[PDB]
Amino acid sequence: AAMNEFARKKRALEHSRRINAGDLDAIIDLYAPDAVLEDPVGLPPVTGHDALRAHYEPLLAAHLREEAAEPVAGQDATHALIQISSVMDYLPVGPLYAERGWLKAPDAPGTARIHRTAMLVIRMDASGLIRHLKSYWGTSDLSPAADEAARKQMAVDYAERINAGDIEGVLDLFTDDIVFEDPVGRPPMVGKDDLRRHLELAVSCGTHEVPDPPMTSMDDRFVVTPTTVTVQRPRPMTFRIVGIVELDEHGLGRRVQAFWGVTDVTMDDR
Amino acid sequence: AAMNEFARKKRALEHSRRINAGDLDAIIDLYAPDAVLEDPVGLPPVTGHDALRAHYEPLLAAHLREEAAEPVAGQDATHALIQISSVMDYLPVGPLYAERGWLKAPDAPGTARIHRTAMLVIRMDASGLIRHLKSYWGTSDLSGGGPAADEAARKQMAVDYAERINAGDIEGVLDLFTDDIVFEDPVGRPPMVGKDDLRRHLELAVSCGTHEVPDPPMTSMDDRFVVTPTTVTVQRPRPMTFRIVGIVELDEHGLGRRVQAFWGVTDVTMDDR
Amino acid sequence: MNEFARKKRALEHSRRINAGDLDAIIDLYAPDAVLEDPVGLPPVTGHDALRAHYEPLLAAHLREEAAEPVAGQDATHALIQISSVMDYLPVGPLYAERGWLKAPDAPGTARIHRTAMLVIRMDASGLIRHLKSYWGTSDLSGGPAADEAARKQMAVDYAERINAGDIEGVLDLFTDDIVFEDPVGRPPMVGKDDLRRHLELAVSCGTHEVPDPPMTSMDDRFVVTPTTVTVQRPRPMTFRIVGIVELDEHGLGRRVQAFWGVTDVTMDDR
Amino acid sequence: AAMNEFARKKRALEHSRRINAGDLDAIIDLYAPDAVLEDPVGLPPVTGHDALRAHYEPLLAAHLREEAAEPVAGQDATHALIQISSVMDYLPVGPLYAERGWLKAPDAPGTARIHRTAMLVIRMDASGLIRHLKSYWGTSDLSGGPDEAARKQMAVDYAERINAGDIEGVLDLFTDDIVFEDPVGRPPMVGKDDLRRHLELAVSCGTHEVPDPPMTSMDDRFVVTPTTVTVQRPRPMTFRIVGIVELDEHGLGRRVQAFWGVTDVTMDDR
């Protein structure tokens, strides 16, 4: 059913539970034998249980503690998305972050901590095992200051423009080449003409968008934005959505994926 | 006299001694608070105790161990040079090397190791603290991808120098350098400029009967420098033997533009008795 | 601008190039038009910059031999394959500088042979808004191919694997992120599951692919493959197609655009 | 060797005279058969009469006219330096300049012109034949079109500080590796201790420097500065000097060459 949406969202939360629990066998158990992990998105991906154990053991050693937001489901029978707020001891991974220039080295590495906020995109198979997990976070999500954090601005510009009914200003945020899915799981659309019809539909039933602060991938190719969205017609409803936008060399929107599930809509009535 | 020379050499060995010991505070103690580190030369430099700890902690974590050759001193009251052979766990720095294309990632990273040979050029102040440390190594000085490609083409410049000058082929040696060449030998005395000065140095060299035997060279990461430890003997005015390390900065076309021959008074041996 | 008009216009462009008149050429471009030649270099904009780009070529007596264009099913695109020959002077020296070409011994008599794919976007009046010219170092003579030759290999592999029906071997050529339009103008397919269903249909209808030698962009991020494709079912048909594939870090297929027009399908054989 | 300073300075002007004359054979005759030309410094050099004809014919074709300043000599029996202001028709070279990004292409190429100001550094052999000619100019020296103009500022900073007696601030403009000739023909000094002493004599004799607007190489590695310099001790004298400074990664001066001839010292000026 669309009850399997709940299954994926449950497994998503279980992942966070097992991390906080610290049991490494319990964590690896959630993964297919051949799963693929990108953390953070932009680093070369990593494959197989051995590599997972290698990635997760130092984190568990740093007493990583995760606070999970409410997941949302994709309408594709595989995906659940979940935002995480992390804290860990700066050692032993901190130094590697600094060595990559992601983080300014602390004065007292034995007492420093590392705070992170990331978006987890988890692709599961019918048995609920994780096949591919993407963790989206960049330097502005670690312990809005780069010329590349104004690429986070593109999330504010979209919502602000669309709430005003400024369709052309929305269309300007994207390449003429634009591919978009909304919801992820239904056939996608291409080019600013389809998008215009999508957005004209949106304005007419009265949609209103409110983003939470976005995250980026590490290479700033991607901007991840949780929004809450309301519509008036054909029924007052509220949607919990997380939208991923891939950017081109000029900061234009190349691809958009709006993740929200049937269990992410509320028929509010007041 | 050259007593400060031994101080620096001893300190160079102590640095390696503290690495193998694994105590990170002991290591940072050898460094001035504003010290500058380039490891490998070619990567943008790094400054201050905080950045040093970020650099040394993952290395120590990989149980890095060092075998040091016996240092040489520079004749300027600051410099000591020392060759190092390292081995460390592939994790956690290995992945960082693989990302940069310095390395081909191994098929069992959890048990793999990384061998490196480098030349450390250490500048100390009058108190013996490190002010500036340059670590010379490149892709052909790294086990994981000896892939001597066009880096081997620049390492050949070391073999040519020794072979040609041993043969007295002064002009073939001069062909190895820019007409702009700057040449200190020893470092700490005023250098010569241009191939006319260089020719006379080399004419002198051949006449005193100098004979060079180089160790295998190292390069920087960007292959702009070629580091060559040599042993050199001369017959006149006195049979002597020098332990030298020569650093050559190359130009766009691989020509030798700047050369620094590091050796101290305590790196010479009087022979034939 | 139906499919026929756009194709005819593509040849007209090549005709005016052979005609040698620079004014006639610029007349075909919107005043704010954009040119990329080769794809991978920064673009060029506006009639003034266009004159700067074409004048040295025309002085070198550039003569093009054009293949039959194909149309995109999107009311804007015509694509056309080009073979060039021109004097080595005055641009050849500039190519040698960039490492694209080995300087010749008798530059006063040398020629430059080039094969490129022109992707031409026209607006409704038939003026060119955006022109992309795909050619790389292995498509220039006066080929080398170092890693281009392995990324060019990806086209030979696709056709060969799919001809044998090795569906899973085909999927391995692409990322899980894959976007596949086929034809451009109909809604695209997302993910290897869509792609599997597409490839199963392809295999079942008896598709057989025969590629011309591919081209790349200059940065080898794109591989352009003209193929002739025949199917047996539901009828023996023949498609004239050109495929543009965007590659990632590891030479995998990120996005695929298969251009072919309604007027590019016949009931022939080969 | 032969060719005194007056001889070399006159040959410098004769070269320019023959350029304006338009006879290509006459120009080439001034060059050794194996001579080397760099125009501009930063591009690969060209060698031998044959390449030279190839370099000069398009320039003469655009009716290149030169206004030559008064040369200076090097005190080394080989070098003469001379500043040139060029003008030529935009065709035939202009389009190629624009292709490399040195120029914004004009609207009317058949009437446009190209203005250039460069410093020619000419090495002649004992017969007065040119062995090596370097032409220093960059985009900021071309009627294009300021690039890393902050790299041109190092001339104003040098002059202002040494005029003020601010030795340490002057020394701050150079690497500790600094190699300094002054005049070219006298043995060079290395390192800031030597340079400090040189500058102390300079300040004690009351030197005062007035720079003309500098030029750069194309790759902005070199800053060429014509100055007139006056001293008060032991007699009030005036020097016509042109200084070449090679910069490092961070814009520090790594090598400096002060060209001035025995015939460039006068008793005149204010």
Rg of the Cα trace of chain B?
19
Distance from CA of C187 to the nearest CA of A (A): 6
Taking the C-alpha atoms of residue D121 and residue A33, their distance in angstroms, rounded to an integer, is 69
Angle at B180 between CA B175 and CA B183, to 5 degrees: 85
**A269 CB-contact burial (10 Å; exposed 0-12 / middle 13-18 / buried 19+):** exposed
Cβ atoms within 10 A of the Cβ of A81, count?
29
Task: Measure the N-to-C terminal CA separation of chain A; round to a whole number of Å.
Answer: 29
Cβ atoms within 10 A of the Cβ of D270, count?
8
SS3 string, chain A, reads CCCHHHHHHHHHHHHHHHHHHCCHHHHHCCEEEEEEEECCECECCEECHHHHHHHHHHHHHCCCEEEECCCEECCCCCEEEEEEEEEEECCCCHHHHHHCCCCCCCCCCCCCEEEEEEEEEEEECCCCCEEEEEEECCHHHECCCCCCCCCCHHHHHHHHHHHCCCHHHHHCCEEEEEEEECCECECCEEHHHHHHHHHHHHHHCCCEEEECCCEECCCCCEEEEEEEEEECCCCCEEEEEEEEEEECCCCCEEEEEEECCHHHEECCCC
Taking the C-alpha atoms of residue D161 and residue D172, their distance in angstroms, rounded to an integer, is 10
Taking the C-alpha atoms of residue B164 and residue C67, their distance in angstroms, rounded to an integer, is 59
Distance from CA of D111 to the nearest CA of C (A): 13
Pick among B76, B78, B181, B193 to test the D interface (most D CBs inside 10 A)? B193
Sign of the CA dihedral D78, D81, D87, D93?
positive
Into which CATH architecture does domain A153-266 fall? Roll (3.10)
Tokens for D33, please give them. Answer: 């058969």
Q: Which residues of D touch C56 (CB under 8 A)?
A: 92, 95-96, 99
Task: Indicate the DSSP class of residue D262.
Answer: G
Q: Which residues contact C143 (CB under 8 A, 6 or more apart)?
A: C137
Beta strands in D72-221 (DSSP E): 72-73, 79-89, 113-124, 130-136, 174-181, 189-190, 208-211, 215-216
The H or E element spanning position B85 is strand B79-89
Q: Which residues of C touch D94 (CB under 8 A)?
A: 52
Q: Which of A50, A54, A99 sits opposite B55 (nearest CB)?
A: A99
Contact: C176, A132; criterion CB under 8 Å: yes
Domain B151-270 has CATH 3.40.50.2000: no
Pick among A99, A102, A107 to test the B interface (most B CBs inside 10 A)? A99
Phi–psi pair at D120, nearest 5 degrees: -95, 125
Q: Which residues of A touch C188 (CB under 8 A)?
A: 179, 188, 190
Report whether B129 contacts B35 (CB < 8 A): yes
Taking the C-alpha atoms of residue D85 and residue D65, their distance in angstroms, rounded to an integer, is 8
Report whether A216 contacts A151 (CB < 8 A): yes
Cβ atoms within 10 A of the Cβ of A107, count?
11
3-state secondary structure of D48: helix
Strand partners, B122: B80, B133
The distance of Cα B146 from the centroid of its chain, to the nearest Å, equals 18
**B9 CB-contact burial (10 Å; exposed 0-12 / middle 13-18 / buried 19+):** buried
3-state secondary structure of B100: coil
Q: Which amino acid is at B124?
A: M
Per this entry, what is the length of chain D?
Answer: 270
Report whether B181 contacts B258 (CB < 8 A): yes
B190 and chain D: CB distance < 8 Å anywhere? yes
Give Cα separations from A92 to A100, B4, B95, B97 (angstroms).
14, 39, 15, 18
Look at residues D17, D19, D29 and name the one whose alpha carbon lies nearest to residue D56. D19
Residue C247 region, left (φ>0) first, then alpha (ψ -120 to 50), else beta?
beta
A236 and chain C: CB distance < 8 Å anywhere? no
Chain breaks of chain C after residues with C–N above 2.5 Å: 142
Distance from CA of C259 to the nearest CA of A (A): 14
Q: Which residues of B touch D188 (CB under 8 A)?
A: 193
Contacts 24+ apart (CB under 8 A), D205-208: D205/D231, D205/D232, D205/D233, D205/D234, D206/D231, D206/D232, D206/D233, D207/D162, D207/D231, D207/D232, D208/D163
Task: Indicate the DSSP class of residue C220.
Answer: S
Look at residues D99, D93, D150 and name the one whose alpha carbon lies nearest to residue D116. D93
Domain C148-266 classification at class level:
alpha beta
Report whether B221 contacts B149 (CB < 8 A): no
Contact: C56, D95; criterion CB under 8 Å: yes
Contacts 24+ apart (CB under 8 A), B167-175: B168/B206, B170/B199, B170/B202, B170/B203, B170/B206, B173/B202, B174/B198, B174/B199, B174/B202
Tokens for D71, please give them. Answer: 């040369």
A50 and chain B: CB distance < 8 Å anywhere? yes
Distance from CA of C128 to the nearest CA of A (A): 15
Q: Which residues contact A136 (CB under 8 A, 6 or more apart)?
A: A40, A41, A118, A119, A120, A121, A215, A216, A217, A222, A224, A244
**A4 CB-contact burial (10 Å; exposed 0-12 / middle 13-18 / buried 19+):** middle
Q: What is the dihedral of CA D71, D76, D77, D83, to 10 degrees?
A: -20
Taking the C-alpha atoms of residue B59 and residue D144, their distance in angstroms, rounded to an integer, is 52
Q: Which of B96, B98, B110 sits opposite A100 (nearest CB)?
A: B96
Chain breaks of chain A after residues with C–N above 2.5 Å: 143
Phi–psi pair at C75, nearest 5 degrees: 60, 15
Q: Which of B58, B98, B109 sits opposite A95 (nearest CB)?
A: B58
Taking the C-alpha atoms of residue C153 and residue C138, their distance in angstroms, rounded to an integer, is 12
Report whether D211 contacts D243 (CB < 8 A): no
Give the count of alpha carbons within 13 A of C247, CB side only. Answer: 25
Tokens for B183, please give them. Answer: 């040449």
Distance from CA of B118 to the nearest CA of D (A): 24
Rg of the Cα trace of chain C?
19
Task: Measure the N-to-C terminal CA separation of chain B; round to a whole number of Å.
Answer: 25
Label the pairing between strands C128-134 and C29-36. parallel
Q: Which of A44, A50, A99 sits opposite B58 (nearest CB)?
A: A99
Contact: B57, A106; criterion CB under 8 Å: no
Angle at B177 between CA B176 and CA B180, to 5 degrees: 165
Sign of the CA dihedral A121, A123, A129, A135?
negative
Distance from CA of A91 to the nearest CA of C (A): 31
Task: Indicate the DSSP class of residue D141.
Answer: G
Report whether A123 contacts A151 (CB < 8 A): no
The distance of Cα B70 from the centroid of its chain, to the nearest Å, equals 13
The domain spans of chain B are 3-141, 151-270
Task: Indicate the DSSP class of residue B104.
Answer: P
Inter-chain CB pairs, A–C, below 8 Å: 16
Q: Which CATH number fits domain A4-141: 3.10.450.50, 3.30.1370.100, 3.40.47.10, 3.40.50.720?
A: 3.10.450.50
Q: Which residues contact A209 (CB under 8 A, 6 or more apart)?
A: A158, A159, A162, A163, A227, A228, A229
3-state secondary structure of B271: coil
Distance from CA of D108 to the nearest CA of C (A): 8
Look at residues D123, D137, D125 and name the one whose alpha carbon lies nearest to residue D66. D137
The H or E element spanning position B49 is helix B49-61
D186 and chain C: CB distance < 8 Å anywhere? no
Inter-chain CB pairs, A–B, below 8 Å: 43
Taking the C-alpha atoms of residue C79 and residue A190, their distance in angstroms, rounded to an integer, is 19
Tokens for C74, please give them. Answer: 């999107």
Q: Which CATH number fits domain D5-141: 3.10.450.50, 3.40.50.1970, 3.30.930.10, 3.40.630.10?
A: 3.10.450.50
| C:51-90 residues touching chain D, CB 8 A cutoff | 51-53, 55-56, 59, 89-90
Q: Which of C51, C90, C107 sits opposite D96 (nearest CB)?
A: C90
Contact: C48, D91; criterion CB under 8 Å: no
Angle at C63 between CA C57 and CA C64, to 5 degrees: 110
Give Cα separations from A235 to A203, A238, A269 (angstroms).
14, 10, 9
3-state secondary structure of C171: helix
Q: Which residues of A touch B96 (CB under 8 A)?
A: 96, 99-100
Taking the C-alpha atoms of residue D212 and residue A30, their distance in angstroms, rounded to an integer, is 73
3-state secondary structure of D159: helix
The distance of Cα A267 from the centroid of its chain, to the nearest Å, equals 25
Domain D150-266 has CATH 3.10.450.50: yes
Q: Which residues of A touch C190 (CB under 8 A)?
A: 181, 188
Report whether C80 contacts C65 (CB < 8 A): no
Give yes or no for a cis peptide into C38 (omega within 30° of 0). Answer: yes
Q: Which residues contact D236 (CB under 8 A, 6 or more apart)?
A: D230, D267
Look at residues A31, A19, A28 and name the one whose alpha carbon lies nearest to residue A53. A28
Cβ atoms within 10 A of the Cβ of C34, count?
18
3-state helix, strand, coil in chain B (%, to 5): 30, 35, 35
D144 and chain C: CB distance < 8 Å anywhere? no
Distance from CA of A191 to the nearest CA of C (A): 9
Taking the C-alpha atoms of residue A14 and residue A35, their distance in angstroms, rounded to an integer, is 17
Phi–psi pair at A211, nearest 5 degrees: -90, 145
Taking the C-alpha atoms of residue A67 and residue A17, their distance in angstroms, rounded to an integer, is 9
Angle at B4 between CA B1 and CA B7, to 5 degrees: 140
Phi–psi pair at D144, nearest 5 degrees: -70, -110
Q: Which residues of D touch C48 (CB under 8 A)?
A: 104-107
Taking the C-alpha atoms of residue B116 and residue C149, their distance in angstroms, rounded to an integer, is 33
D107 and chain C: CB distance < 8 Å anywhere? yes
Taking the C-alpha atoms of residue A33 and residue A129, their distance in angstroms, rounded to an integer, is 9
3-state secondary structure of B272: coil
Taking the C-alpha atoms of residue D265 and residue C144, their distance in angstroms, rounded to an integer, is 57
Distance from CA of C30 to the nearest CA of D (A): 15
Label the pairing between strands B192-193 and A237-247. unpaired
The H or E element spanning position B81 is strand B79-89
Phi–psi pair at B214, nearest 5 degrees: -85, 145
The distance of Cα C67 from the centroid of its chain, to the nearest Å, equals 11
B44 and chain D: CB distance < 8 Å anywhere? no
Domain C3-141 classification at class level:
alpha beta
Q: Do chains C and D touch (3 or more CB pairs under 8 A)?
A: yes
Distance from CA of A112 to the nearest CA of B (A): 12
Report whether C113 contacts C157 (CB < 8 A): no
Pick among A41, A180, A190 to test the C interface (most C CBs inside 10 A)? A190
D5-141 and D150-266 have identical folds: yes
A192 and chain C: CB distance < 8 Å anywhere? no
Taking the C-alpha atoms of residue A135 and residue A117, their distance in angstroms, rounded to an integer, is 10
Contacts 24+ apart (CB under 8 A), C138-141: C138/C216, C139/C114, C139/C115, C139/C215, C139/C216, C140/C95, C140/C100, C140/C101, C140/C112, C140/C113, C140/C114, C141/C112, C141/C113, C141/C114
B41 and chain D: CB distance < 8 Å anywhere? no
Taking the C-alpha atoms of residue A103 and residue A94, their distance in angstroms, rounded to an integer, is 8
Taking the C-alpha atoms of residue D69 and residue C136, their distance in angstroms, rounded to an integer, is 45
Q: Which residues contact C71 (CB under 8 A, 6 or more apart)?
A: C3, C4, C6, C7, C77, C78, C79, C259, C260, C261, C262, C263, C264
3-state secondary structure of D140: helix
C107 and chain D: CB distance < 8 Å anywhere? yes
Phi–psi pair at C153, nearest 5 degrees: -65, -25
Phi–psi pair at A131, nearest 5 degrees: -100, -30
Look at residues D103, D31, D22, D30 and name the one whose alpha carbon lies nearest to residue D58. D22
Taking the C-alpha atoms of residue D176 and residue D173, their distance in angstroms, rounded to an integer, is 10
Q: Which of D43, D44, D95 sits opposite C52 (nearest CB)?
A: D95
Pick among D47, D79, D179 to test the B interface (most B CBs inside 10 A)? D179
Taking the C-alpha atoms of residue B180 and residue B198, their distance in angstroms, rounded to an integer, is 10
A45 and chain B: CB distance < 8 Å anywhere? no
Look at residues A221, A234, A264 and name the one whose alpha carbon lies nearest to residue A38. A221
A188 and chain C: CB distance < 8 Å anywhere? yes
Chain breaks of chain B after residues with C–N above 2.5 Å: 145
Report whether C48 contacts D106 (CB < 8 A): yes
Beta strands in chain D (DSSP E): 31-38, 46-47, 65-68, 72-73, 79-89, 113-124, 130-136, 174-181, 189-190, 208-211, 215-216, 222-231, 237-247, 253-259, 265-266
Label the pairing between strands A253-259 and A174-181. parallel
D48 and chain B: CB distance < 8 Å anywhere? no
Taking the C-alpha atoms of residue A86 and residue A114, their distance in angstroms, rounded to an integer, is 8
B100 and chain A: CB distance < 8 Å anywhere? no
Strand partners, D225: D243
Phi–psi pair at A25, nearest 5 degrees: -60, -40
Sign of the CA dihedral D214, D218, D219, D221?
negative
Residue with tokens 């020629």: C111
Cβ atoms within 10 A of the Cβ of B121, count?
23
3-state secondary structure of D9: helix
Sign of the CA dihedral B166, B170, B174, B175?
negative
Q: Which amino acid is at A167?
A: I
Taking the C-alpha atoms of residue C123 and residue C30, their distance in angstroms, rounded to an integer, is 9
C21 and chain D: CB distance < 8 Å anywhere? no
Contact: A105, B61; criterion CB under 8 Å: no
Beta strands in chain C (DSSP E): 29-36, 44-45, 63-66, 70-71, 77-87, 111-122, 128-134, 140-141, 174-181, 189-190, 208-211, 215-216, 222-231, 237-247, 253-259, 265-266
List the chains bordering chain B where 3 or more Cβ pairs fall under 8 Å: A, D
Taking the C-alpha atoms of residue C231 and residue C229, their distance in angstroms, rounded to an integer, is 7
Q: List the resolution, Å.
A: 3.0
